[PDB]
Design a binder for this molecule. Structure first.
Ligand code: MG
Ligand code: MG
Ligand code: MG
Ligand code: MG
Ligand code: MG
Ligand code: MG
Ligand code: MG
Ligand code: MG
Lengths: 384, 384, 384, 384
């Protein structure tokens, strides 16, 4: 189970670089030079790295320091063969963003947020990124009166429309992906799930430029089925990117390594991604637990990729097993894929076998055989 | 706080008519004749009632018994002045629907589900209903392999498209509203939240015919902010109907009377509905607890309407209070409603006050004054 | 992975016998004769069965019908070699228990509940049961004023004390196990977790007669770590019995087959039970999904036992792996098992290496190596 | 609704002093001098303040700086009349505690944790504290193999037993209160609820010295009923202290001001505390949202006390209302407080009215009238 760059595994600088500061504790690890992270990730078999602007260029850096930082970073990419497929903006750490970026109540902050984002889109394009992610972590509220959500959605649409006008006018070949999260650090965050993000995109002026970047743990913080949500995103043609990690239920955002948390959900996710032919990066947005030293950081990163590859093998074996293929037919998955009424509305209305002479009791007695199918899935996952 | 029919309060037959059967217990109340429910609800001050087909006409009824049941029902409506603004299909109780209706794996069941629905659309139109609700309670899965969600969404789109073709071809003036629920009775239900439903509607052939019927408790079963979700539905122009009740957190669907459960969420909901000018029915989908006899059923129903009217008064007092209006300006809710960049993209790019010469530290130091605003909201809710 | 009676697997009559009635649907399966369930479970490799009084003898049965039902049941046990290690009372289905049994507000109901329980203790002892389980499913409330919880705990203590006096006075060799559940069917249930049950037991007059019967899914309905709770129960010497099933997060009680739901929690549970030498029954309290016919019921039951046996093998391989044993020492699990201060209080106070000259920065820099240990656990679970 | 010191309101230094650092953002407020917090809280009407050792004396302070800091603090207490009823240890912020204090795998860390705690017990006693709180925020795990929970409970018992030996040997009049939390910052925290803490205390060598310090938001992070848990703690005689705040459901620990979050749970909590005659401090462990400047900090603190006093008035009016008293009798709360069988076991067995001639159908038909009682409670809370 050794990763190759053709497995398309990517990591954020802020993942292995997380120093371990949490709401109740100081950092347990020293800062990582982005250049060292690139080289260590390259040796593990990753395909590339992603960044927030403030990960690479500390806030307030002079334009000269900014150019020096980018040059060192570019040299590390050249030295390693690593790519930068995705970038994002930090609109959440600095105190100015305490009430949001694109939907801050203060108009001057919203303008500043847009200019900060546009500056990093230029840099992302320069470094070859194909997707630009927006996680509106501070867009939301702790109390009901603080945010008129209709006005806030107007402002969010205005911001994304302006960003689309910018990339269109510059001729950039980059697309946007909205990353939903239900809560944390705000009490409730706007566009809290994949569904809300997908719905919002359809109201943008140029919807074809926007998709979603769902994260395993975020949908699970709402108790939702992550593979189901990914299926809906794929169905809509909007899965532009994906963030892989682990989460144990409805609680704070754990960002465990992928494979940890809900293991069977991870199996069904990989099954779906591989069956659907998802060709984007397999990006890990995880945090090595602050119990770990730097050797544990690399072991945790390695485990992300290993667990994906193990699950990929087991899901492939599941789908290729002739007894599973017969069980799928026994459960009528083949019939689910057939149109209900390709014969059309009036033929359905005239079809006495669909109502007047339909034997409901015979249909009701047919078992779905789902439990046998699921135990075959369990046996394959466990190698049993 | 006495309701009038002009308050637009409606109840489902299945609400006050719930006999109290739960997964662990027998019924504690006798069946209610729909005619008696209409008259008792009329005396409480309700504006109308809603029904599933199987609430009014027991499953398997002959066409003659069906006509007799409708006639008795129509006479009760005429006797009381009660209206029927909404109707729905029961595609969840009968065993034939154990794997769903519109997305059952068995094709013959899906055809039967559509014919059962179409028959009740005709009846709903006959009785004057303006909205037809679809709650896909059995559409979903308990295990990963049982349902290919992309194929299931294809089937769900096919079913709703066929329904839209039906109403269009018949010239009916009725619209559809999808009611999301995250889980129960299926392990995960398709279109689990308002967001997922809104996103799905945009892929239908005639999206203007479809909106959402969100329910307080259902979004709270995902830990989501119900007023936020309603705001997004209103923002999209898709709030066709609404189901009011109470829910205490992430657990089984409690269907408590409205006002119970999360009281402050109920206050912010009423504030939003009244401020936005929502003109649809205020529908209660609640269950009188099975601890109650029939006098408790009517007390619980009365409390639904009373709590709405109390909250309506308190929210109106909140918005009209001059000290609240000044606090809203102190928190810059006025600035949230102003466009970020009506001056346009290039002016924003050339605006040095938006980035180069923006004083981030002065902006960051400005308190949002949200806690004072929220305590004014608390004082008004409590009459303090 | 074939079960033998020496694996101590047991099932409730109400598990494979569940007809599939849920809050929104009719039964999908016919009733099972308890005699047929005993024989089918015996053929699958189970060691025994458990029952509620009302599973075996329908409510209201004459004393003659009761004797006939027990005799048929006893003959099936004799024919199959099946044992009855546990029994319980149904104090939740009949409408008289709508506000509880032992803590119903009505005093006459509480007396009736106790007499119904005592009658079944006599039967359980006659059939050889060693543990008597109490699940107070109706003890609780939907609203705050309905139940004074201090008075209700007084009544619950009174009931269990009377039961202990009964078994002591009759010389029975049976013990009691309280089964906690946080909610459903009541809005909140008294003694909602393993912890609350353990704490309550210490206030009973004869605490040695009472322990807990924790259920996987119930603790997970509170988002708790089930292996952690079992460890505390074992630590207290109170794990008298255990209910195994699966649950996907905080939602309604799913009662999925064991192994489904949180797979890694199931692995750590089996690891703990086998390492601690738990010698009680491995009881499955699960519901075959109502999608299933009777062949699916037996496949689901078989999968309970299969998944336990697979996990038992993998946990044993984990603990026996020399690289895991070295990793445990690397993470200082050996030091966790050593006393902090067997040298005593005053020696600790005089130990300058414990404070004055303790190098906190050297200690803080030591990685815990937990992520490498957890990936070894993952590899072993998956057979990788 | 103006607080007086006789209302016994207390605040932690770390509450109004929270600078607003969260997992995703920098501090939004400057540090508060503890002396200024004491004076500002005194002017709001608080009775006293609480502290962690590291709040008052920064980690690593020389013994001379420590004496200067305590003297300045003592002078502020003398100047204001403020008391220090409770103190606690910070065993969670410094990196050395990354795997816990009392249950760290490393033995030398556990010894250091005990010495750090003992040093602050001496200081707490010097300043007049009656309760010493232990919140084991780092005791727990993110993965299953990292912590043997039985060994960890052995170590936790060893630590608390040693602390009890210390206070007994020094003749101190101080008691201990364990503060449970289910998760955050560890993936799962040991003793996650009030129940688990109560159960653990009964295994300590001197259980009379230990009780619980439950926090509103912590029990709600497990979806539990906080008033129910407080009732069980009072029933056990173990409510030594209480932490008041607000929380919106199962998510990260919000620490909202008291009254926010679940408003009706706050009403039933105050009802219980006042009816039971709880005489301990009313302590607020809350965080002013980081959106706020220092004027918002004091408004949030003021709102804690105001909301308690409003709810106290409404609960008192509820219990004193003659129509509520009659409704309580209608719901048989009076019968709940009467013994089930003060006549004894054998009389219950001989009582034919308790079983043989009990009319279950008449009993089952009696409504509990809980919904009318709850709407009276709602009307009183809202002043309607
Ligand atoms: Mg995350
Ligand atoms: Mg992410
Ligand atoms: Mg509902
Ligand atoms: Mg509804
Ligand atoms: Mg269960
Ligand atoms: Mg059970
Ligand atoms: Mg807290
Ligand atoms: Mg606290």
């Amino acid at each position: 189970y050794q990763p190759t760059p053709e497995d398309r595994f990517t990591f954020g600088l802020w993942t292995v670089g997380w120093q371990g500061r949490d709401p109740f504790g100081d950092a347990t690890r020293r800062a990582l030079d982005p250049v060292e992270s690139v080289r260590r990730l390259a040796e593990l078999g990753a395909h590339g790295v992603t960044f927030h602007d403030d990960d690479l260029i500390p806030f307030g850096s002079s334009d000269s320091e900014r150019e020096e930082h980018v040059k060192r970073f570019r040299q590390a990419l050249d030295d390693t063969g690593m790519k930068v497929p995705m970038a994002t903006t930090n609109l959440f750490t600095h105190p100015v963003f305490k009430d949001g970026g694109f939907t801050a109540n203060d108009r001057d902050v919203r303008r500043y947020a847009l200019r900060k984002t546009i500056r990093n889109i230029d840099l992302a394009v320069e470094l070859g990124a194909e997707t630009y992610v927006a996680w509106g972590g501070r867009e939301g509220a702790e109390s009901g009166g603080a945010k008129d959500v209709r006005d806030a959605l107007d402002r969010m649409k205005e911001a994304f429309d302006l960003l689309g006008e910018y990339v269109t006018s510059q001729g950039y070949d980059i697309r946007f992906a909205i990353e939903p999260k239900p809560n944390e650090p705000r009490g409730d965050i706007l566009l809290p799930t994949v569904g809300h993000a997908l719905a919002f995109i359809e109201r943008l002026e140029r919807p074809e430029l926007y998709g979603v970047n769902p994260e395993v743990g975020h949908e699970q913080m709402a108790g939702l089925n992550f593979p189901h949500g990914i299926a809906q995103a794929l169905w809509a043609g909007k899965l532009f990117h994906i963030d892989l990690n682990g989460q144990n239920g409805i609680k704070y955002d754990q960002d465990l390594r992928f494979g940890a948390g809900d293991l069977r959900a991870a199996f069904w996710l990989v099954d779906l991604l591989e069956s659907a032919g998802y060709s984007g990066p397999r990006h890990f947005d995880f945090k090595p637990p602050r119990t770990e030293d730097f050797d544990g950081v690399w072991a945790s990163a390695a485990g992300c990729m290993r667990n994906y590859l193990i699950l990929k093998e087991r899901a492939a074996a599941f789908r290729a097993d002739p007894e599973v293929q017969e069980a799928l037919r026994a459960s009528r998955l083949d019939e689910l894929a057939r149109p209900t009424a390709a014969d059309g509305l009036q033929a359905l209305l005239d079809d006495r076998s669909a109502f007047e002479e339909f034997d409901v009791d015979a249909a009701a007695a047919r078992g779905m055989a789902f439990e046998r199918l699921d135990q075959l899935a369990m046996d394959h996952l466990l190698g049993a």
